[PDB]
Design a protein around this ligand. Sequence first.
Ligand SMILES: NC(=O)c1ccc[n+]([C@@H]2O[C@H](COP(=O)([O-])OP(=O)(O)OC[C@H]3O[C@@H](n4cnc5c(N)ncnc54)[C@H](O)[C@@H]3O)[C@@H](O)[C@H]2O)c1
Ligand SMILES: NC(=O)c1ccc[n+]([C@@H]2O[C@H](COP(=O)([O-])OP(=O)(O)OC[C@H]3O[C@@H](n4cnc5c(N)ncnc54)[C@H](O)[C@@H]3O)[C@@H](O)[C@H]2O)c1
Lengths: 349, 345
Amino acid sequence: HMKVLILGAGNIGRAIAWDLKDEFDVYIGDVNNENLEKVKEFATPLKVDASNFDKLVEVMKEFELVIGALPGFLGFKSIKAAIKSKVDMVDVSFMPENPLELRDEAEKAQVTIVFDAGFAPGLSNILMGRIFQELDLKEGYIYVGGLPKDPKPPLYYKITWSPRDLIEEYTRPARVIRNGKVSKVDPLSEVKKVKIGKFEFEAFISDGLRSMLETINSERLEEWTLRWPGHLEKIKVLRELGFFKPENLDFTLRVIEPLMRYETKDFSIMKVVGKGEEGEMEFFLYDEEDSMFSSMSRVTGFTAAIISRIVAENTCTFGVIPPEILGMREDTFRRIIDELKERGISIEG
Amino acid sequence: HMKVLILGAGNIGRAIAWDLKDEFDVYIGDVNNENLEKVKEFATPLKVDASNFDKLVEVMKEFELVIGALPGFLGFKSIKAAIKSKVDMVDVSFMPENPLELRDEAEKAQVTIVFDAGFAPGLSNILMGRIFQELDLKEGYIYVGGLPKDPKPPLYYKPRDLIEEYTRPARVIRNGKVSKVDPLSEVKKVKIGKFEFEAFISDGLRSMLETINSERLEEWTLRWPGHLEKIKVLRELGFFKPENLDFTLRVIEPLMRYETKDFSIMKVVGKGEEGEMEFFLYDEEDSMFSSMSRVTGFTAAIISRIVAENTCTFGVIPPEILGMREDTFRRIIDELKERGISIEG
Ligand SMILES: NC(=O)c1ccc[n+]([C@@H]2O[C@H](COP(=O)([O-])OP(=O)(O)OC[C@H]3O[C@@H](n4cnc5c(N)ncnc54)[C@H](O)[C@@H]3O)[C@@H](O)[C@H]2O)c1
Ligand SMILES: NC(=O)c1ccc[n+]([C@@H]2O[C@H](COP(=O)([O-])OP(=O)(O)OC[C@H]3O[C@@H](n4cnc5c(N)ncnc54)[C@H](O)[C@@H]3O)[C@@H](O)[C@H]2O)c1
């Protein structure tokens, strides 16, 4: 079993570790011990600060694969480290910067990096890429949400993944492709009711499309994030009052985060729609928290691990590769769907 | 000629001194030199710490009237000090405690204390008092606001005392009894004149709760639209909890701090077995004083004159009593008019 290093022992990172524990000798580095304590049984913990770049690259030379599960602010650097250190990487962090900026350096260094390998982006992109190949795509829609099974006031949401990254969904523009071009909207500004199966949600346009903006050529492309009602209106007022400004964000989170940390199971819901000249395609996912992990962890984490296997297998070329590429080729797409099913994540359509 | 002592050179304390400046020999005491400085041209400042009861009574002994313009936490003590000093006092501090508590002591001391002598409570009490006598009153309504003439987003208003209104229970009279309600539970839309407002129940009735024998009594405080919906959310999420409050203010104080002109408005309505009575007033900021300062400070100043004139009896008198008397009520109304404050009805 080859050596693998996962950066970050957060909820996502721990799930990736669990999934890969018997196929690789996995090492997971984090800066927080309490989190590392959680993983000693299945991975070998390392005290690592991804913050320190020259130091990080040194740790990297030992391994043949790195998987990134850091907070978003730290991701671009880790990618940089991997490339300098010449190790293949699969990254899940919700980084603000664009990984494709690093494409040349990656190609030259002959390593392959797959970024945004989570639930959405990630599996989200992969399904779209598939639709993109199978259809002469005109319009694409993604509806996605990680939600609490039993929502509760006052915020009706359960925190399952990094909150700093989460607030960003509300705080910056969301881009879409309208009339064939990229366009920006205020996410908070247009919220609508959508019903999917039994559920009634409020949906807002979000900035999850990411690489798909350049990658998927269609007239219309939008991703909508799903929420229980009552959540967004409250968030909007906070934003309006400046509570999300960087100066106060830490303080505001301290207040609100506890409200969103109550006991409930969580679920994952995704719907992907593709419209073409002759036909439409629709994919659907519903997942729930298992005994060990939240759905968000399962879906984001297992998807990354599955992708990691694909990379370790040498399937892919050098450079920085968007996750939707994986969708576009049949062998890779099918494998992903199959592995997901193995793990109880059933994607339909 | 008559020597008068004002406790606190704050906005209100300052307005009052200004009003009485020609008529009385007015001295004003504070711990804060900056405020003391603002007032030295029309009154004589003194350094007095209201915290010190024994020192307070000693200073008071030199005066024939004391006017209280302190913070609420110091108010009850000031009244006590005046009683011991045997000096009449008019108090405008928004103290938590009930002054009526000191009623026997004041009576024994042969002094007159009028309390809650401001705009609301105060003038509002006086107007309602008129109505209580004139009408067989069953329902009484008071609407009051101190607002920016020009409101800016997101708050639409221009600190702790303000939040406290959102936070604490308010008392009303329902079915002839006192009940406590959440101030934010019943937000309402009301229009007065050319004005569209949002209102919430407030805790201003106070003395009137015992004093006005009525089936329904409520005080509603007015806000420009779009302010309280935001306020409710912040409370809901815990931003108003005491541990978090300091930071919350830091975030939201600035929003409500912008250049504009304030104004004061009041509408008092009384409903009776036969007939309805109603009063209204609108005031604006001026060259020297905000509207709030003018309406509050003047009313207190006017009341002081009445007290200094030996109109009243011994003891602790709720302001509504001044309303209940025709002579007193007229004088107040008339004096207000001279100062540019017109009340109609
Ligand atoms: N594509 C998607 O669906 C999706 C979904 C969920 C999470 N994510 C992304 O996955 C990344 C992590 O996910 P999470 O929710 O597990 O994050 P988390 O915030 O739960 O934990 C982040 C982990 O990184 C560790 N860490 C922070 N700075 C570090 C440092 N200097 N050195 C070593 N460790 C450090 C933290 O200690 C923590 O253990 C985030 O970028 C998140 O945005 C993406
Ligand atoms: N009924 C109403 O409409 C109404 C309206 C406005 C104010 N008020 C009440 O009037 C009181 C003062 O009103 P303001 O708005 O002028 O107050 P403000 O807070 O502007 O100033 C209070 C003044 O009290 C002085 N002071 C504080 N502690 C002192 C101490 N230990 N010794 C000497 N002085 C001290 C301060 O130094 C300041 O000068 C407060 O109880 C307020 O609640 C009532």
